[PDB]
């Protein structure tokens, strides 16, 4: 009962020059800012009617992350980060039932650095519209976790595949799902 | 296929029995390793590895940078917790329970918080052995799901019932099958 | 209106 943890998990990454600032509540994203749009984005739209958080402060708080980043890169005699491969897995929002809206879940977990490529394939063909994802959700052992969502009407006719690619994955990792599940 | 360098700071406030005992914890990580940190109970920075020593020293030298890191547990943790309890600490979403065959499967989905109990009853009496779980499973949308499977001989007349105990609901949920 | 979530201010390293 009520023993909780809130985390401010941010990060900067050279040479990709990308970074993220996000809060974690017992493992769920409360919100995050995109260095890209300079807009804070709550995980559950609603939360934004209960709390406020100006984006800059994060961006601001990131600049220092780069500065410090560099400073540490040198101090470390330019040693590079050791890549760790993702461990993909396919999920379904709920148990699938024909003609009943549902949602495929691509679960990218236990990896690093925070850089990946995910691609949804409905019968070889990739899906580009309607999909969605999470930022880089922080893990306890300090690796990364990510989620990719593709809502859909369950059927036997078509099948799906999640294609994750990582700098620790020799060949693109490929996961399958077909109206069925273990 | 070019090297990458990673700064991973982590400010993690730890609450226990609400706000009665908080614990700040500033933690830095060059690439995936902890270098320098700050425990709110150690009252001052400490390097876990070499790469952080300098960092540990310089911060411990500046009064501000310490008068702050200490003031964390009150002006940051107690603060935020006060702002998000309303919608997180108290968040509660009821489980959607379904039972279908294979081996009997009881599926609990879309619930929150993750605390949960799933029990099987065979003709009115809980079966304590022969169950395979899947453990809690986050979905990244603020709702967990888990499946519990019971291995049995579905004989006629028999009635199986999945019982799901969850803070979201006042009296346990149960769905019977057959 | 609306309570604001404070963020721990990042400090510069040596």
């Amino acid at each position: 009962k009520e023993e909780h943890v809130i985390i401010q998990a941010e990060f900067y990454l050279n040479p990709d020059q990308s970074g993220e600032f996000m809060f974690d509540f017992d493992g769920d994203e409360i919100f995050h800012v995109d260095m890209a749009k300079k807009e804070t984005v709550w995980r559950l739209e609603e939360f934004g009617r209960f709390a406020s958080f100006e984006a800059q402060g994060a961006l601001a708080n990131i600049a220092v992350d780069k500065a410090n980043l560099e400073i540490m890169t040198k101090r470390s005699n330019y040693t590079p980060i050791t890549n760790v491969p993702p461990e993909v897995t396919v999920l379904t929002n709920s148990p699938v039932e024909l003609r009943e809206p549902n949602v495929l879940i691509c679960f990218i977990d236990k990896f690093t650095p925070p850089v990946v490529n995910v691609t949804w394939l409905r019968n070889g063909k990739p899906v580009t519209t309607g999909v969605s994802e999470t930022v880089f959700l922080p893990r306890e052992d300090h690796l990364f976790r990510k989620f990719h969502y593709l809502p859909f009407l369950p059927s036997t006719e078509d099948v799906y595949d999640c294609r994750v690619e990582h700098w620790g994955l020799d060949e693109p990792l490929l996961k399958h799902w077909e109206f069925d599940a273990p | 296929t070019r090297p990458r360098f990673l700064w991973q700071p982590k400010r993690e406030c730890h609450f226990f029995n609400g706000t009665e005992r908080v614990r700040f914890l500033d933690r830095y990580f060059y690439n995936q390793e902890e270098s320098v940190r700050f425990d709110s109970d150690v009252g001052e920075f400490r390097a876990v590895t070499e790469l952080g020593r300098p960092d540990a020293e310089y911060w411990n030298s500046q009064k501000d940078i310490l008068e702050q890191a200490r003031a964390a547990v009150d002006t940051y943790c107690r603060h935020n917790y006060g702002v998000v309890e309303s919608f997180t600490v108290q968040r509660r979403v009821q489980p959607k329970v379904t039972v279908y065959p294979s081996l009997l499967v009881c599926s609990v989905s879309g619930f929150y918080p993750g605390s949960i109990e799933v029990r099987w009853f065979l003709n009115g009496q809980e079966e304590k052995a022969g169950m395979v779980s899947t453990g809690l499973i986050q979905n990244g949308d603020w709702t967990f799901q888990t499946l519990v499977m019971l291995e049995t001989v579905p004989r006629s007349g028999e009635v199986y019932t999945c019982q799901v105990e969850h803070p979201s609901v006042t009296s346990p949920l149960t769905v019977e099958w057959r | 209106e609306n309570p604001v979530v404070h963020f721990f201010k990042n400090i510069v390293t040596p």
């Epitope: - | 008068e67 009150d74 603060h79 | 201010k9």
Partner: T-cell receptor
């Protein structure tokens, strides 16, 4: 009822506040003033430098107190403190 | 750093006009600022909070109507009193949280402005 000193006496200004504090700011004053940014006392106690100055925060009774180990002509004024309420916005509301 | 500039320090507008004060910033970015209206003794009073990031603005206590705040810079703000009266004559000081303070809310008040709205 006066700060008798051109050198020494004790400033005894009890500044209070309503909402639970996070940060405590000290601003004593002249007329048409910008400030007096003395020092900041955040939830804790004892931080007061530069002599006539003495910051004593006591959450228990919701009140501070600035004491001056050495009055002067410049240190006579109109003084008050401002505070930011916790788990609120960043707004600061002075006291008295 | 820190510095503040309320353009019209001493401004005179007939009892019935529009006097506009411009709380600006130095070399820091101010996502949010505040307007305090003080008089002879009463402790500096908070009139409203103004913050870019479209979020409107939050007038305090009850003072509600006129006196319109237009924060757009994240540098500047602007307080245009509407109409006018010889009761609105008081001191007008403004602060501006340093967008990067984060916790330890760091604000910096401006010099001030005495609006002389004579009848």
């Amino acid at each position: 009822q006066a700060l008798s000193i051109q050198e020494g006496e004790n400033a005894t200004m009890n500044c209070s506040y309503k909402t639970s504090i996070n940060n405590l700011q000290w601003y004593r004053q002249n007329s048409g003033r910008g400030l007096v940014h003395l020092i900041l006392i955040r939830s804790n106690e004892r931080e007061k430098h530069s002599g006539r100055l003495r910051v004593t925060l006591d959450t228990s009774k919701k009140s501070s107190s600035l004491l001056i180990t050495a009055s002067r002509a410049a240190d006579t004024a109109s003084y008050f403190c401002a505070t930011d309420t916790t788990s609120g916005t960043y707004k600061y509301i002075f006291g008295t | 750093g820190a510095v503040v500039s309320q353009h019209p320090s001493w401004v005179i507008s007939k009892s019935g006009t529009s006097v506009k004060i411009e709380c600006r910033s130095l070399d820091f970015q101010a996502t949010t600022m505040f307007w305090y209206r003080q008089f002879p003794k009463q402790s500096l009073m908070l009139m409203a909070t103004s913050n870019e990031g479209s979020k409107a603005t939050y007038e305090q206590g009850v003072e509600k109507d006129k006196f319109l705040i237009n924060h757009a810079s994240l540098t500047l703000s602007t307080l245009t009193v509407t109409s006018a009266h010889p009761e609105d004559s008081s001191f007008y000081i403004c602060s501006a949280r340093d967008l990067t303070s984060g916790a330890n809310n760091e604000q910096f008040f401006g010099p001030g402005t005495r609006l002389t709205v004579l009848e």
